[PDB]
Design a protein around this ligand. Sequence first.
Ligand code: HEM
Ligand SMILES: OC[C@H]1O[C@H](O[C@H]2[C@H](O)[C@@H](O)[C@H](OCCCCCC3CCCCC3)O[C@@H]2CO)[C@H](O)[C@@H](O)[C@@H]1O
Ligand SMILES: CC1=CC[C@H]2[C@@H](C1)C2(C)C
Length: 461
Amino acid sequence: GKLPPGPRPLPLLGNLLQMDRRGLLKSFLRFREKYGDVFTVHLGPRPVVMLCGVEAIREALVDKAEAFSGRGKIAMVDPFFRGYGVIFANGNRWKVLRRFSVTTMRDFKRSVEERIQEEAQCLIEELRKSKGALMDPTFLFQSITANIICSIVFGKRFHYQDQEFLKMLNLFYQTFSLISSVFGQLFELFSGFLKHFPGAHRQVYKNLQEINAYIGHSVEKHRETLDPSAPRDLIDTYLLHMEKEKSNAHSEFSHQNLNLNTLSLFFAGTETTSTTLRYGFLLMLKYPHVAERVYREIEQVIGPHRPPELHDRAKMPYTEAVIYEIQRFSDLLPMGVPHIVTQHTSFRGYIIPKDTEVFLILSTALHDPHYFEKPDAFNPDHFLDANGALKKTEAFIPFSLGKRICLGEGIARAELFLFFTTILQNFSMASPVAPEDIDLTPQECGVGKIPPTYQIRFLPR
Ligand code: HEM
Ligand SMILES: OC[C@H]1O[C@H](O[C@H]2[C@H](O)[C@@H](O)[C@H](OCCCCCC3CCCCC3)O[C@@H]2CO)[C@H](O)[C@@H](O)[C@@H]1O
Ligand SMILES: CC1=CC[C@H]2[C@@H](C1)C2(C)C
C-alpha cells in the first residue's frame, strides 16, 4: 500500500539527522536493525529503498527483473557521464551498449587468458627488477588490470614505467577515492545544494575530463587508420557500427557513447580488480600462514615454474577459497551500484512507485552470519567444506545479480586467480609491520571500499 518503513524524515534534510557519522553503509546497517531487510531512507530530497540480505536482493534482481533492472545515478559522477556508456545507461541505449560491450569483449588475436598470462609474466619480471625493495603496489596492480582492458580496447598495453600511463592511473585512483570519501557520501544526499560550491565533485569532474581527452585522441588516431575489413580492437568495432548506422540520427552509436562507454570499461576495468588485489596482499601480510598454505598448493599442483593457467583452478580448492574470501572480506562495492524501478511494482506487500531509487546492499549478503560464521573476520574456511573441498554459496554475490550483473565477472575472476597465483608462485611477501599490528580498516568506505596504503616487499623464491 505504501513504501517500505524507515526513519521519519524532515522536509529539506531527509534522514540526515538519523545518520551515522561513519558513513552511509553504517547508517543503513543501523536502520536495518530497527526496520528489517526492506526499508526506506530519504537521502536529502528523495526516498531510496534499501534491500538487504541474499533473499530480498535476489527476489528483486532475479524474480522481479522486469522492474528492478534500471540504473540510478551516482551523484559524484552523473555530471560527467550523464547516462551515457554501459554502466550509466538505461532503456534501449543500455540494451545496445550492453550487447555491444559483452559481445566485443569475448570476441576479437589472443584469448583473454593468454593476455593475462603475458601480463603476469611482465609483472613478475618487474617485481624481480625491484629486488625485494619496499613499494606501495597500487600502481602495479592498476597497471596489470588496466593493461588487460587496454589490449581489448586500444589494441595495445602500456609499459609500467611510462609516466603518461602512470598519470592516467593516478587519476583513476584519486577519483575512486574522492567518490568514496565522506564528501562523496554527503554529495549523494545533497548534490542539489552542494554543487554550487567548491569541493571534490569538481576535482572528479576534471579528472574524468582529463581521461576523456586521451580517449578522444585515441579514437581519432583509430579513425585515421581504420581498415574496415580488419578491425583491430573494440574502438575499431564501435567505429564500424557507427558507419553502418550513420543514416539513423537516433543511433546509439554516437560519439559521446563512444568516449563514455570506453571510459566506463576502463574505470571499472582498472579500479575494481586492482583494489581487490590491494586488499588481497594486505590480507596476506596479516595472515602469512594463509599465503604459505596457498604457496604449498601452487607447488604441489603447478610446481615452481610452469605458468599458472585457468584449468589449474579446479585442482586448487584452497587458493580459490582464499580468493573468494578476499572478495567477500573486501566487499568492493558495499551498496552495489544504484538501481531504479522501471515500473510500479509490489515487493513484499509494499508498493514501489516507478523511478524510485533502490540500493541493493551487497555487503549484507557478504556478511550474512548464516552463511559465514564470524563474518567480520578473514577466514578462507568460509569457503571450504569438512574435507577441504571448495564450498560455493548463494550468498557470494560481490558482482551482484540479474540483468545488470557485472559484465566483467569472468575477466575479473581470471585476473584475480592468474595474478594472485603467479605472484605467489614467484614471491613471498614481507613488510616492516608485524602481522598483529596490521590494520585492515578501510581508508574510505562509501561507494567503494578502499584499503589503507601500505608498503610491501616481494621476496624471490
Ligand atoms: C573484483 C572485480 C569486480 C567487482 C567486485 C565488480 C562488481 C560490480 C558490481 C557490484 C556491479 C553492479 C551491478 C548492478 O548494477 O547491480 C558491476 C557492474 C559493472 N561492471 Fe563490474 N566488478 C568487477 C570487475 C569488473 C571488470 C574487470 C569490468 C570490465 C572489464 C567490469 C565492468 C562492469 C560494467 C561495464 C558494469 C555495469 C553493468 C551494467 O550496468 O549493465 N567490472 N560490477
Ligand atoms: O586532447 C587534448 C589534450 O591533449 C594533451 O594531453 C595528452 C598528453 O600530452 C599525453 O601525455 C597523454 O598520454 C596518455 C597516455 C596514457 C593513456 C592510458 C590510459 C587512458 C585511458 C584509460 C586506460 C589507459 O595523453 C593526453 C591526451 O592526448 C594536452 O597536454 C592536453 O592539455 C590537452 O587538453
Ligand atoms: C564496476 C564499478 C561500477 C560503479 C563504480 C566504479 C566501477 C564506478 C564506475 C565509479
